[PDB]
UniProtKB/Swiss-Prot annotation, chains A, B:
Cofactor(s), names only, from the UniProt record: heme
Source organism: Corynebacterium glutamicum (strain ATCC 13032 / DSM 20300 / JCM 1318 / BCRC 11384 / CCUG 27702 / LMG 3730 / NBRC 12168 / NCIMB 10025 / NRRL B-2784 / 534)
Protein name, as recorded: Cytochrome bc1 complex cytochrome b subunit
One term of GO molecular function: metal ion binding
Compartments where found: Cell membrane
Amino acid sequence: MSLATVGNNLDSRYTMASGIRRQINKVFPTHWSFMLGEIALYSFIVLLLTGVYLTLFFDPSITKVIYDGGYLPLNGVEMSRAYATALDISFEVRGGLFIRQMHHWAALLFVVSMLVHMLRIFFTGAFRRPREANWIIGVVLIILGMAEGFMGYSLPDDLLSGVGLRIMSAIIVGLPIIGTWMHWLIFGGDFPSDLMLDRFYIAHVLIIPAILLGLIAAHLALVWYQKHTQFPGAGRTENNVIGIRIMPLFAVKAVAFGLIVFGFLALLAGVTTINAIWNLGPYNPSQVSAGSQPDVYMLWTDGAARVMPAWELYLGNYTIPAVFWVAVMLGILVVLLVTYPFIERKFTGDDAHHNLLQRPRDVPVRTSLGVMALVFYILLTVSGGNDVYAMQFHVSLNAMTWIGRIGLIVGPAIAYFITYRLCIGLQRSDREVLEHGIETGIIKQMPNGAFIEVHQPLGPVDDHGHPIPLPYAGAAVPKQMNQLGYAEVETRGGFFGPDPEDIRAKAKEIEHANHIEEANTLRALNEANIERDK
Amino acid sequence: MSLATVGNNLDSRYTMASGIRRQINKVFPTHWSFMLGEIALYSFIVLLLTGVYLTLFFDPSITKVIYDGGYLPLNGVEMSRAYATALDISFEVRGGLFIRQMHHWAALLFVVSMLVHMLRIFFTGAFRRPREANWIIGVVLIILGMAEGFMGYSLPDDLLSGVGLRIMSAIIVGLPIIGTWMHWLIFGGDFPSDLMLDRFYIAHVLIIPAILLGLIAAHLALVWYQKHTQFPGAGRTENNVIGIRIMPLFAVKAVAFGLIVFGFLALLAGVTTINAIWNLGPYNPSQVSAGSQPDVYMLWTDGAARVMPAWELYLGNYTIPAVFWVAVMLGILVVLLVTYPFIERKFTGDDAHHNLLQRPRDVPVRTSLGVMALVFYILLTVSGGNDVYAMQFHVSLNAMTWIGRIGLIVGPAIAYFITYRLCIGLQRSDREVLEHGIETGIIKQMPNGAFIEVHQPLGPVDDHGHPIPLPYAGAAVPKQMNQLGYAEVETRGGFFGPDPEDIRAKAKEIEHANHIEEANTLRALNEANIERDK
Ligand code: HEM
Ligand code: HEM
Ligand code: HEM
Ligand code: HEM
């Protein structure tokens, strides 16, 4: 076939035969955690493309028009050109509503996917040496992704977006030397300003996407260069990777998971409404709603402003407003996240070149601090949303603010305590299995009447008839007998009937032969590791 | 110093020591041609950054306002928001005029730098195998760079831009099935349309810059991967590169030439006016000027429309306008440029893996066709500008159109004839020197009265006392004696006086010793090439 001619013509010119061989043969581990990041990547792809489709219709201008579009309930209402063009996307373009909702849902999925991916990186310990650079890059990404998404939903100039813009401007003006100067620099004047929405539009469609794309490219390039970490397991060492090659069996799975995420987004974009701007009306600074919170990924920085106890300083001709302290708090919160691996180094007392991951149970301090930060962030989030929470679940609004205040101290401590003790209990169960074997659950009575539970050893048994303890290795310990194969089906066939018996027996024989062959190869690989380590 | 600690910390994590060594040791030839492309690259950098500064002030909206800005001569004039914000850049922002002019001059320098770089690639033969891909990429770049720049100067919605937009729309609507449909797709309706300037704005600031950046990145990456071509010379072969390493002596020169181009742009941006929009007035479809040509890089496609002899087809209920044929012509013109290396292959009868460049004199057909295309393009350009040409140089406007028409046939033929014969004469001079030696110009009279000119041989001399001819090698042949060193200064020192004589003599001795040492090393390298080729 002419495919060989194409390949020849390519390689005779570019000599890629050595390199692409090395690329296709790279090995990637197959844990389920290790494609959370791919979700964020796929969401970003969708964010790009749907965004580019929205720009052929959106007009980022704060100057007014008397609306005369397809949405009849606002004919004659004087509105910003931004809001009018967003409405024309929603109503006058075939399927523009579908697209706009997909863009928004993709933004939410992108941010939460980054959050969960970062949680995996934090708990499993993958940020450690040499990979802390990917942490410093990645934290910047999850900051900018929020910064972008915020100004992304600020653009339509509806009533719910402009209040968040008002909040941002009023926070900037309050800074204790340069606030007025920084505000006049950013907005080009007092708020609302003529040049405001175009600066934010270009910041949203060109600048921050360009930076995110560059940083994501560098991130993935670095992950590819220094190969992926892995969990401890049979035959795994600090100096090797066990998994599947990037093709055929991994690239197709990446394509398939891309398809799944893509289609999931296209479903939820048509089936759930998001940001129904047409019933919010255009922005004017005199109007506000009871539930006027920012997007979900910004609710934490709303909740901070809700829980600060109004401490304000007056110094003669000057004043530090009460909102400077939430800026300090949120900055400290961001600094701690940004610089984490080094404050981990200074107290952990090690600088080793780790390539194997820690199970979160085996590192109770870090996982306890992670759950502590999770409850802190969640209390900030729900305090941001407490207006809705109190309205729906009928808890007094003052009680919600005080729950946020006192909880941001107390609840983290309770989280740390419970998380630490639970982790210790988990690893105690692991040791109990490794030194006594699995508890099958089969209870038998001896002739003496003693009730005994037969335990099924994993390692060899002493001549007294009891297991010899194994050393814990960091790999997961099986805790039941269905996880050793002992509940697998003996019958073969589909629904409504069996396979013929000859096929049945031969298939089961081949299955068991493979099951012992893979055990043998992993066992020999582990023994080779022992020999090669001395 | 702590620099060593930084380097250690880096390489212990990323292991870049092998790779960056290989990068810094890459060799690049030093011909003056081989940084024309860098000019285009630097211009593109400037185009990006100055453009990003212009977007904090520009508002791409076709909806109107009564102007009240700093430019008093248009107070009260109702104008588009685009035009008003461009005026506010020019007059209300400190130094916005300086920036806007720099952006425009950078665009012109970018396009002409691409043109001259491509001319180098065409004449020297660098497009040949394996590098034709860089040709196919590069031609696309020099198309899109023009497409962008056109819509770049269309954005302000002034009177001179909107006429070009009118021309584009009226050409699109004339296509012989889909013209009306394609126009309604692109513009969102009839011209001028509400969504027009925002589609062009996003196409100008996001889409085409993103594509140009990606293609330029791929272009430079490919040039780096397969190493740069070189001219034939002493010690040069198809299998090696002779020049300087990318650092220290090349990277600093790249920085320095970047500085020179940058500062040149900053000078000419403040010293020459470009596109003085403030005296053109806002666009309205009923008004036009005598000199209303598009930008310079679009004048060719204007000139085509000027020289087409109005051939129009009528078919019952349908008509093919007279402007369809210029579309066909310009498309043929672009196709020929895009697909050139293969129509070079089919008639040249070779598919070899060339790495040494051809001097343009040695390939008279291709260089003659190149000058033929140059005169064709220049006649198209000046026909595009003939309204100005006839007004200034006092040649009748009809005579200019007929000069364009008949010249686009005749002048290419004359160019081919003259270019071919001149190239043959050049290489004849080269052979004459190589078989008779340099003509010094020293004329002496023999005792017989015969007037002789002493010739200075390059190669050995036969026992009859006359040079043995050398075979031509494609490298330049020296044609005078000042190019062999024989006019170099014997004195040393600055203005107003000499160096002391001891310093003088020692410096000259070292100079001549180095001059013979480099000759010896190149001679030995060439002999090694002969031995290694057999
Ligand atoms: C849009 C943002 C991001 C994208 C597209 C992304 C993508 C990826 C992908 C695909 C992987 C490999 C597969 C996997 O680990 O699941 C990865 C690994 C990694 N990510 Fe991210 N990620 C993003 C954000 C972050 C954040 C927020 C952090 C941490 C603060 C981070 C730190 C890391 C590190 C250190 C690795 C390598 C860990 C290892 O090799 O085991 N990344 N990233
Ligand atoms: C090529 C990059 C992007 C482009 C061109 C783009 C374009 C746009 C445009 C024009 C709008 C306003 C028009 C409308 O409401 O439909 C918008 C809104 C929005 N953007 Fe983007 N965007 C891009 C990337 C992103 C990214 C990376 C995120 C998230 C981090 C994001 C999140 C949002 C959100 C949440 C909205 C509000 C949607 C709505 O209110 O309906 N966008 N985007
Ligand atoms: C903005 C557009 C372009 C940029 C930034 C660019 C940049 C460069 C640079 C820096 C080089 C190496 C140094 C030099 O040759 O002077 C190069 C080489 C080259 N360029 Fe371009 N160029 C552009 C457009 C083009 C065009 C329009 C063509 C042809 C149609 C082209 C074809 C080539 C080829 C084939 C080479 C390699 C030739 C060799 O190795 O001798 N490029 N380019
Ligand atoms: C990041 C990429 C770019 C951005 C953000 C950008 C931005 C802009 C903006 C906003 C304008 C109109 C405002 C004004 O008149 O001052 C403009 C005009 C223009 N652009 Fe760009 N541009 C970019 C790249 C380019 C490129 C690559 C070219 C050339 C190929 C180009 C050529 C032009 C020209 C000729 C004008 C007209 C200038 C004038 O009329 O004063 N631009 N650009």
